[PDB]
Amino acid sequence: INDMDYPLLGSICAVCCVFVAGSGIWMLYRLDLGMGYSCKPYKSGRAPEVNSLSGIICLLCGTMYAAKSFDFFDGGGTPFSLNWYWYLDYVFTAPLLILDFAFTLDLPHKIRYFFAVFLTLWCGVAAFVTPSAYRFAYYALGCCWFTPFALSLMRHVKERYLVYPPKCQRWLFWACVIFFGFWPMFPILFIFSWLGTGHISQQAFYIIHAFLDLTCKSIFGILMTVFRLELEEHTEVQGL
Amino acid sequence: INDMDYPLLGSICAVCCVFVAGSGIWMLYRLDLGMGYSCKPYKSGRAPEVNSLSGIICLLCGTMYAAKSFDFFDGGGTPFSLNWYWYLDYVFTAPLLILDFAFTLDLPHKIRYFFAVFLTLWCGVAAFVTPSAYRFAYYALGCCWFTPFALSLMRHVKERYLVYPPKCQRWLFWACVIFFGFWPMFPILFIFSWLGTGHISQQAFYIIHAFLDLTCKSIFGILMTVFRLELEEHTEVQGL
Amino acid sequence: INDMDYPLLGSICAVCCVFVAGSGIWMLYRLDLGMGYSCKPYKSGRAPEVNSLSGIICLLCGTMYAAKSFDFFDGGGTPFSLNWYWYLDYVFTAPLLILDFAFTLDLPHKIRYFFAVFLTLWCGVAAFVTPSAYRFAYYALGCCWFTPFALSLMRHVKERYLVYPPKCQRWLFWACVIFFGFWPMFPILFIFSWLGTGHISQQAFYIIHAFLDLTCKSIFGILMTVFRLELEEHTEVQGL
Numbered sequence: 147i148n149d150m151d152y153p154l155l156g157s158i159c160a161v162c163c164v165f166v167a168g169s170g171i172w173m174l175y176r177l178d179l180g181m182g183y184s185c186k187p188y189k190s191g192r193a194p195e196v197n198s199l200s201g202i203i204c205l206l207c208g209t210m211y212a213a214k215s216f217d218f219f220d221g222g223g224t225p226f227s228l229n230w231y232w233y234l235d236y237v238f239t240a241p242l243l244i245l246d247f248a249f250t251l252d253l254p255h256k257i258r259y260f261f262a263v264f265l266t267l268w269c270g271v272a273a274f275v276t277p278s279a280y281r282f283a284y285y286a287l288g289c290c291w292f293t294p295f296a297l298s299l300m301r302h303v304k305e306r307y308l309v310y311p312p313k314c315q316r317w318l319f320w321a322c323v324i325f326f327g328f329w330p331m332f333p334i335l336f337i338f339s340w341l342g343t344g345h346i347s348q349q350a351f352y353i354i355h356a357f358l359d360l361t362c363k364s365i366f367g368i369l370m371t372v373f374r375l376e377l378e379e380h381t382e383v384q385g386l
Numbered sequence: 387i388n389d390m391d392y393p394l395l396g397s398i399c400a401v402c403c404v405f406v407a408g409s410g411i412w413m414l415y416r417l418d419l420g421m422g423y424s425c426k427p428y429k430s431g432r433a434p435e436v437n438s439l440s441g442i443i444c445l446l447c448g449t450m451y452a453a454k455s456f457d458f459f460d461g462g463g464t465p466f467s468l469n470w471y472w473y474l475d476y477v478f479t480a481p482l483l484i485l486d487f488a489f490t491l492d493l494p495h496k497i498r499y500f501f502a503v504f505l506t507l508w509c510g511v512a513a514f515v516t517p518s519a520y521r522f523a524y525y526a527l528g529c530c531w532f533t534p535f536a537l538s539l540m541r542h543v544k545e546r547y548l549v550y551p552p553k554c555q556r557w558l559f560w561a562c563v564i565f566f567g568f569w570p571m572f573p574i575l576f577i578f579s580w581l582g583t584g585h586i587s588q589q590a591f592y593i594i595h596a597f598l599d600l601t602c603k604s605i606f607g608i609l610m611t612v613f614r615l616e617l618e619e620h621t622e623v624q625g626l
Numbered sequence: 627i628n629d630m631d632y633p634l635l636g637s638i639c640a641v642c643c644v645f646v647a648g649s650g651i652w653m654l655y656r657l658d659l660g661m662g663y664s665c666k667p668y669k670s671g672r673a674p675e676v677n678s679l680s681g682i683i684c685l686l687c688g689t690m691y692a693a694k695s696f697d698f699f700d701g702g703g704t705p706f707s708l709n710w711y712w713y714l715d716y717v718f719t720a721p722l723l724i725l726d727f728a729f730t731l732d733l734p735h736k737i738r739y740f741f742a743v744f745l746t747l748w749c750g751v752a753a754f755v756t757p758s759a760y761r762f763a764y765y766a767l768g769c770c771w772f773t774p775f776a777l778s779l780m781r782h783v784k785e786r787y788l789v790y791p792p793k794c795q796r797w798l799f800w801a802c803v804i805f806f807g808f809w810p811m812f813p814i815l816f817i818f819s820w821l822g823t824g825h826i827s828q829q830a831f832y833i834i835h836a837f838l839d840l841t842c843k844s845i846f847g848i849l850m851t852v853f854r855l856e857l858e859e860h861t862e863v864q865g866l
């Protein structure tokens with residue numbers, strides 16, 4: 147029912163729009179001046195193309211949040227909503243999150259990891275738009291995709307977590323908290339939302355989701371950016 | 387008219403959902419233990435990223451079939467149908483089929499081959515949704531894309547079919563049967579369906595399409611997987 | 627209001643459909659016989675995959691124009707329109723234009739350049755479909771994406787424009803005219819169209835847009851093709 151407090155939801159989106167986008171602008175700025183903390187200039191003179199994927203998602207996420215605010219500030223139900231169809235944008239950003247994570251730590255099966263998340267969210271898009279007993283079938287189909295994705299990722303992360311120096315592991319550990327602790331929270335709120343159990347309020351739903359993306363995009367991007375700065379500093383200017 | 391036997395169509399989709407997805411899980415499992423039949427471990431320890439594209443399409447095709455079943459099992463006309471708009475999913479899998487085929491045999495013009503199929507199907511999506519005299523114009527526009535695509539592919543396949551050892555050529559020949567014998571059957575059923583001639587029944591349409599994807603995705607994926615196993619066995623452990 | 631002269635608009639689209647597609651077929655034909663004007667055969671025997679991106683866009687643009695004509699020739703409002711939602715196709719071709727430009731001149735930040743244009747147009751798609759005070763917010767959000775994109779591109783182009791020989795610079799200069807002189811004309815007509823100021827007539831809108839794509843796709847593709855022919859001729863057969 148169209149009775150939730152959109153001005154609030156819009157404001158929330160606008161506030162996190164600046165934070166996520168601003169973090170993206172910072173990490174893009176921090177990328178193109180130094181390999182590490184000593185600001186080592188790239189010998190060729192061009193930062194690796196895959197490195198920028200962390201900043202772009204935040205700007206990609208920040209650009210979407212601006213849209214969401216515009217949807218909320220206009221009273222909802224806009225022709226270009228990005229909120230009526232849920233996880234619709236996630237389809238474009240979440241598969242990119244694992245792509246840079248796989249690129250940052252050289253995790254194998256990158257195309258499998260992309261299509262694991264890509265197929266995971268399209269079930270969530272299908273689950274939302276289908277009010278019926280088969281909504282959870284898509285959820286089950288979606289969870290049939292994420293569960294083998296969350297697994298083997300923990301195995302892959304663990305196999306290389308022990309290779310990094312202790313300085314670099316602290317940021318990776320905090321990336322794993324964001325990664326293996328909060329990504330499983332999207333399916334959990336799907337069960338408890340008005341779609342299933344009914345705990346999460348229709349309005350509340352957006353606000354907690356607004357406050358997780360910061361952790362999943364921006365803060366995850368910051369931890370990835372700081373982790374890469376530590377990684378290159380230990381390997382390039384030190385040769386260790 | 388909504389009077390076809392969806393439970394049947396759904397069951398068909400569900401049965402081939404397990405077969406296509408199960409074949410994809412097998413070929414992904416068969417990929418990451420051996421270069422060839424001797425199960426030669428990859429020297430770096432990570433199977434090539436382009437190799438997995440054969441398995442992923444089946445899981446990508448199997449995930450879609452589950453959706454189609456859910457559309458049929460719910461009586462049709464679901465908000466997330468994947469059946470109301472035809473060839474809509476093909477847009478995501480058929481361009482990937484030629485991408486791995488081009489990658490498997492090192493065929494040139496891979497981006498031209500991707501956009502040949504990608505533009506071929508978007509005319510089929512447009513042809514379906516347009517009941518008018520211009521449906522066949524999109525079909526003609528689509529066939530104006532596939533016909534120069536089917537050609538030059540036969541020339542490209544032939545130029546390298548004679549380089550492979552006789553053991554590897556048997557699977558490639560059976561890939562070509564699936565490739566140059568069944569892909570031209572999608573346009574043929576478009577003419578004869580209720581859209582054009584009227585031979586193929588609305589219901590029958592789905593069942594024959596359900597039974598070709600197995601050949602085009604799963605069986606094609608199996609033949610591609612077996613062909614790659616023969617190819618690497620002759621080249622890696624034998625050096626011939 | 628559905629009272630504009632579609633037969634005209636359709637004819638315009640059909641005439642430029644042949645010109646853009648025909649130019650694409652020429653530059654694809656011109657690509658696969660010679661590195662330069664001396665028709666130097668590629669030593670491996672396969673033109674670089676990124677080189678063909680100039681031809682494909684024209685065929686991608688020509689295929690869309692055929693569709694637009696079919697939409698116009700059928701009276702408008704077709705189920706597969708490509709005209710009802712504006713810049714919707716641009717989302718697929720404009721990000722590819724900058725991708726080959728970045729590839730042709732080895733410009734850095736290619737993924738940033740792709741997502742700059744990709745996010746720029748999705749605001750234009752959102753701006754059109756949203757009749758409200760927030761249409762210009764998407765326009766402002768879109769211009770908040772293009773303005774930092776148009777800039778740094780001029781800096782990047784200038785940094786390498788002085789390295790090319792004078793023969794190659796003439797085509798690049800004429801690419802820059804098409805690039806930095808006409809791309810900023812799409813936002814300008816958005817302001818003055820019936821959406822904003824009201825200068826550009828609903829009908830006129832399509833005809834000037836039809837006549838810019840030729841410059842942005844086809845003629846830009848020709849200038850890119852001629853520029854690459856000059857570039858390789860000076861570097862490959864001359865070694866200068």
Ligand SMILES: CCCCCCCC/C=C/CCCCCCCC(=O)OC[C@H](COP(=O)(O)OCCN)OC(=O)CCCCCCC/C=C/CCCCCCCC
Nearest residue numbers: 209210213223224225226227228230711748749751752755
């Ligand atoms: C801005 C940066 C974005 C970057 C990346 C974007 C990629 C993601 C693409 C997002 C797709 C957006 C689709 C959203 C559709 C929303 C439909 C909607 O809101 O419907 C509800 C609403 C009913 O509400 P009210 O009438 O208020 O009811 C109360 C009674 N007074 O219905 C409408 O407003 C009618 C909707 C008009 C048509 C919708 C047009 C959607 C825009 C099309 C462009 C997107 C292209 C998608 C590609 C496929 C082509 C369909």
Ligand SMILES: CCCCCCCC/C=C/CCCCCCCC(=O)OC[C@H](COP(=O)(O)OCCN)OC(=O)CCCCCCC/C=C/CCCCCCCC
Nearest residue numbers: 231268269271272275449450453463464465466467468470
């Ligand atoms: C699950 C794994 C999938 C993996 C990859 C997915 C990529 C492919 C994307 C598929 C897009 C799906 C679109 C399907 C739309 C179906 C529309 C439909 O069925 O309409 C008919 C039906 C009429 O039938 P009944 O009312 O039964 O008539 C009988 C009278 N009692 O109409 C409806 O049900 C209304 C439809 C509700 C809105 C449709 C919402 C579609 C879902 C949107 C998510 C997809 C995003 C697409 C991106 C662009 C944004 C539009």
Ligand SMILES: CCCCCCCC/C=C/CCCCCCCC(=O)OC[C@H](COP(=O)(O)OCCN)OC(=O)CCCCCCC/C=C/CCCCCCCC
Nearest residue numbers: 471508509511512515689690693703704705706707708710
């Ligand atoms: C051909 C080569 C193309 C290559 C690349 C293609 C990629 C770009 C994808 C383009 C998406 C096309 C969407 C266009 C939707 C147009 C809607 C439209 O015209 O509505 C207006 C019109 C009202 O006009 P009239 O009734 O004449 O009014 C006057 C009163 N007598 O409404 C209709 O006709 C109803 C529309 C029927 C349903 C629309 C179906 C759109 C086709 C779906 C396939 C596209 C898939 C998109 C993916 C997401 C799934 C939605």
Ligand SMILES: CCCCCCCC/C=C\CCCCCCCC(=O)OC[C@H](COP(=O)(O)OCCN)OC(=O)CCCCCCC/C=C/CCCCCCCC
Nearest residue numbers: 163167178191205208209212735738742770774775777778
């Ligand atoms: C929540 C709101 C929505 C969120 C996003 C809104 C827009 C965000 C702002 C722009 C995002 C990034 C633009 C992407 C295209 C530009 C490519 C790019 O950034 O390249 C990096 C390039 C630097 O590369 P170096 O390595 O020094 O080059 C030497 C070659 N080795 O970046 C730059 O040039 C700096 C940024 C552009 C310079 C132009 C300065 C003037 C810009 C006008 C401001 C317009 C308002 C936008 C506000 C934020 C802008 C930072």
Ligand SMILES: CCCCCCCC/C=C\CCCCCCCC(=O)OC[C@H](COP(=O)(O)OCCN)OC(=O)CCCCCCC/C=C/CCCCCCCC
Nearest residue numbers: 255258262290294295297298403407418431445448449452
């Ligand atoms: C028709 C229904 C829909 C069809 C599809 C439904 C889901 C299909 C099942 C999962 C598909 C693939 C998941 C993609 C993300 C995982 C990435 C992946 O497979 O990586 C391969 C990786 C092996 O790599 P190696 O080379 O040994 O690693 C060492 C590094 N050199 O695979 C694995 O780890 C095996 C699969 C995951 C292990 C976790 C085991 C427990 C999984 C719980 C089962 C959940 C139900 C799903 C059923 C099928 C699962 C196989």
Ligand SMILES: CCCCCCCC/C=C\CCCCCCCC(=O)OC[C@H](COP(=O)(O)OCCN)OC(=O)CCCCCCC/C=C/CCCCCCCC
Nearest residue numbers: 495498502530534535537538643647658671685688689692
């Ligand atoms: C405005 C209307 C819509 C616009 C577009 C309509 C369709 C455009 C015509 C086809 C576009 C391109 C097709 C893409 C898939 C083909 C791949 C391709 O072109 O590969 C190049 C390959 C040449 O490669 P080389 O380097 O010689 O190979 C040796 C290996 N080193 O091209 C060819 O083989 C030439 C073109 C195909 C040959 C088949 C000839 C017979 C074709 C029947 C004509 C059908 C009508 C289409 C009209 C235009 C066709 C040119």
Ligand SMILES: CCCCCCCC/C=C\CCCCCCCC(=O)O[C@H](COC(=O)CCCCCCC/C=C/CCCCCCCC)COP(=O)(O)OCCN
Nearest residue numbers: 161162164165166167168169170172183365368369372375
């Ligand atoms: C539970 C409370 C949650 C609060 C939300 C978080 C707010 C943002 C603050 C940062 C969160 C993530 C930080 C991750 C840890 C990195 C911090 C850090 O110390 O980084 C340094 C250096 O790296 C950095 O600079 C990273 C921190 C920079 C973060 C900048 C904040 C994000 C950018 C937003 C600016 C624009 C926002 C617009 C205004 C908001 C309007 C609402 C790494 O080295 P140290 O361990 O200090 O060792 C010292 C010797 N090397």
Ligand SMILES: CCCCCCCC/C=C\CCCCCCCC(=O)O[C@H](COC(=O)CCCCCCC/C=C/CCCCCCCC)COP(=O)(O)OCCN
Nearest residue numbers: 401402404405406407408409410412423605608609612615
């Ligand atoms: C006209 C009847 C069509 C019947 C449909 C086909 C059913 C599937 C059977 C396989 C079809 C394709 C097989 C292609 C040929 C490869 C078979 C083969 O022999 O492979 C071997 C080895 O490779 C293989 O193992 C490939 C065959 C494995 C196929 C496994 C079947 C697909 C996986 C599905 C399992 C899960 C399905 C769920 C249950 C179904 C519920 C409906 C290659 O070497 P050989 O020539 O034997 O030489 C011996 C010395 N090297």
Ligand SMILES: CCCCCCCC/C=C\CCCCCCCC(=O)O[C@H](COC(=O)CCCCCCC/C=C/CCCCCCCC)COP(=O)(O)OCCN
Nearest residue numbers: 641642644645646647648649650652663845848849852855
């Ligand atoms: C303001 C008037 C605008 C008119 C529209 C333009 C019409 C198209 C004409 C070409 C426009 C762009 C040309 C760019 C400059 C390149 C021309 C040129 O000279 O190229 C040569 C060689 O390269 C070429 O051949 C490029 C020109 C080829 C252009 C072919 C025209 C496009 C193909 C369309 C054919 C099919 C169209 C269907 C019919 C139309 C139905 C409506 C480069 O060397 P030169 O400087 O001559 O030095 C000589 C010693 N090397």
Ligand SMILES: CC(C)CCC[C@@H](C)[C@H]1CC[C@H]2[C@@H]3CC=C4C[C@@H](O)CC[C@]4(C)[C@H]3CC[C@]12C
Nearest residue numbers: 303304307308319321322323324325326327328
């Ligand atoms: C409470 C919520 C936020 C998080 C719940 C998940 C936490 C408990 C998970 C997320 C990521 C996980 C870490 C991921 C990787 C490793 C490296 C391994 O060699 C030891 C365990 C360790 C350190 C894990 C401990 C458990 C961990 C921290």
Ligand SMILES: CC(C)CCC[C@@H](C)[C@H]1CC[C@H]2[C@@H]3CC=C4C[C@@H](O)CC[C@]4(C)[C@H]3CC[C@]12C
Nearest residue numbers: 543544547548559561562563564565566567568
């Ligand atoms: C009857 C249906 C299923 C298939 C119709 C197409 C068949 C006849 C086509 C598909 C692929 C084709 C093969 C593709 C490649 C070659 C290699 C060439 O050096 C000799 C011909 C040969 C061996 C072709 C023979 C004809 C062939 C088998």
Ligand SMILES: CC(C)CCC[C@@H](C)[C@H]1CC[C@H]2[C@@H]3CC=C4C[C@@H](O)CC[C@]4(C)[C@H]3CC[C@]12C
Nearest residue numbers: 522523525526527529530533534577581582583
């Ligand atoms: C463009 C070149 C490669 C030819 C490929 C397009 C051919 C195969 C297409 C173009 C126009 C098409 C025809 C257009 C209209 C109809 C009417 C319909 O009720 C039966 C099929 C039929 C008769 C089509 C058959 C296929 C056809 C002839």
Ligand SMILES: CC(C)CCC[C@@H](C)[C@H]1CC[C@H]2[C@@H]3CC=C4C[C@@H](O)CC[C@]4(C)[C@H]3CC[C@]12C
Nearest residue numbers: 783784787788799801802803804805806807808
């Ligand atoms: C009048 C319309 C069509 C075009 C307006 C933009 C024109 C004036 C712009 C577009 C591209 C620009 C050129 C781009 C690159 C360079 C190289 C630099 O080292 C000197 C300036 C020069 C040569 C620019 C001059 C101005 C220029 C030609």
Ligand SMILES: *C\C=C(C)/C=C/C=C(C)/C=C/C1=C(C)CCCC1(C)C
Nearest residue numbers: 233240267270288289292332333362
């Ligand atoms: C913003 C970034 C991320 C990674 C968001 C991720 C969301 C998921 C991984 C959600 C998964 C879902 C599943 C498994 C089933 C129901 C639908 C969801 C999309 C919520």
Ligand SMILES: *C\C=C(C)/C=C/C=C(C)/C=C/C1=C(C)CCCC1(C)C
Nearest residue numbers: 473480507510528529532572573602
């Ligand atoms: C599932 C995999 C494949 C390769 C399916 C392929 C389908 C085509 C190549 C279909 C082509 C069509 C044409 C040329 C014209 C009418 C519309 C079709 C999509 C049926």
Ligand SMILES: *C\C=C(C)/C=C/C=C(C)/C=C/C1=C(C)CCCC1(C)C
Nearest residue numbers: 713720747750768769772812813842
């Ligand atoms: C056909 C190729 C090109 C490059 C067309 C490009 C169009 C743009 C770069 C348009 C930009 C817009 C902006 C910045 C804001 C309003 C919406 C537009 C899409 C017109």
